[PDB]
Ligand binder design. Structure first.
Ligand SMILES: CC(C)(C)C#CCc1c[nH]c2ncsc12
Ligand SMILES: CC(C)(C)C#CCc1c[nH]c2ncsc12
Lengths: 256, 258
């Protein structure tokens, strides 16, 4: 919904998005007392083509209602164009995992993988294909809560059919999810560091896969390997992934 | 932790309908204590994660409380079908109870129920908890002399304070307005407020200064207390400490008259 600019107080810059800086701020509505929010800005939204692309993310996001998907609060469609969203105070997942590398237990890493699998099972139930599942698109709401935060080529995360044929399906999202799980267990390290994008497909074609992260339970790595079946029809769906991640998380909690 | 094994619950008959689904009575076989009759809240749409979160948040809310006039949380079953296990109030829903006992309940019993609910609400106020859905439909009857606030799941326009209707603002003051409506329902033996009036016409009447009339046999002191609950300005409404004290005095005056 359209928000009056007077109801938004722009605060500190908290990140840099594809369209411009992201700020934290305050939304003052008659409904709720003053609420801390995130504000996506758009440097070049004076251009109608750029504005259409920027605002398309808000249109997509408004369709969802899930505990692990960031909520759209509203939009300001007059220049400067702003998207108002739910604030995830701990910020981007990659930076969070890198900073907390030796303070986050394995059970926390598996929990994040599980939570994202519930958001993705929800998207799958709505026949929605994300096309860009990666740790860089996840936000941290609290130490125990992550959310899919961006609905705006990444060769290193892509399923072979997406690279080869530009085919993006529920099965290609599962491949990308497997890469995202690897990134979480690697504490925010990017896949195939130093490898050229053009060499990635060749290695993948040859049967090579991202290695087991240190301290990753073998059951969880077996789940990642299933996400990376070359044949998309052999990849699990999110119902099975969610169920398996829940069992893996319970086994880790029981161990510790 | 409040997780209970499903094998320890024997699901019995349906005893009512809640916001999330049917409520059943059943039996809880705890490891140490004797078999206990319990109420089981079910959730028709808990396959939806958003709905499941809301349903389980009611149990997490109820877990925070311990009061003689608030239904006790016994436990939860977090696997599908998701259930909330709670204290069973054998006489059931307050509205049906007041309607059936319309010619057998004395005024002192009606005032006692208003007083008991005011003690549960003073307790919730002491914990800075805003209910947002105070209504006779959310009250259960434990015995002829004991009522309990029974639901914490949450539009109830006909019970709502004007700021809640106009601005979606819910505060301790808006709960007092709703409590005033609940007191009116009790004194009316379970008749709903504004029967036949459309929800959209409610705000217009309130803003013309219209209020629910004095129930027959309601002591003028008690109706004066309901009118204070319905001050348009939220800052002019009493708090539950004052309401509890005034209801206690009114109950004692009725008992003395009898
Ligand atoms: C990843 C990046 C650039 C920080 C972003 C963004 C959009 C956003 C939505 N909510 C929220 N909370 C913290 S950043 C953010
Ligand atoms: C809590 C709610 C939804 C008002 C209900 C109900 C039906 C019911 C009858 N007896 C009883 N005891 C505990 S809940 C219940």
């Amino acid at each position: 919904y359209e928000i009056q600019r007077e109801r938004i107080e722009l605060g500190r810059c908290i990140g840099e998005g594809q369209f411009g800086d992201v700020h934290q701020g305050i939304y003052m509505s008659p409904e709720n007392p003053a609420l801390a929010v995130a504000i996506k800005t758009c440097k070049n939204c004076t251009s109608d083509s750029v504005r259409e692309k920027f605002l398309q993310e808000a249109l997509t996001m408004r369709q969802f209602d899930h505990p692990h998907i960031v909520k759209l609060i509203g939009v300001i469609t007059e220049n400067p164009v702003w998207i108002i969203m739910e604030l995830c105070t701990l910020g981007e997942l990659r930076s969070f995992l890198q900073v907390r590398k030796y303070s986050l237990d394995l059970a926390s890493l598996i929990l994040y993988a599980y939570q994202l699998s519930t958001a993705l099972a929800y998207l799958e139930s709505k026949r929605f294909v994300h096309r860009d599942i990666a740790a860089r698109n996840v936000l941290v709401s609290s130490n125990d809560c992550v959310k899919l935060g961006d609905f705006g080529l990444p060769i290193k995360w892509m399923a072979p059919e997406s690279i080869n044929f530009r085919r993006f399906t529920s099965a290609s999202d599962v491949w990308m999810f497997g890469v995202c799980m690897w990134e979480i267990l690697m504490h925010g390290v990017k896949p195939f560091q130093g490898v050229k994008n053009n060499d990635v497909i060749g290695r993948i074609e040859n049967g090579e896969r991202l290695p087991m992260p240190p301290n990753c339970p073998p059951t969880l790595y077996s789940l990642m390997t299933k996400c990376w079946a070359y044949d998309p029809s052999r990849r699990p769906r999110f119902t099975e992934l969610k169920a398996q991640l829940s069992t893996i998380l319970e086994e880790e909690k029981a161990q510790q």
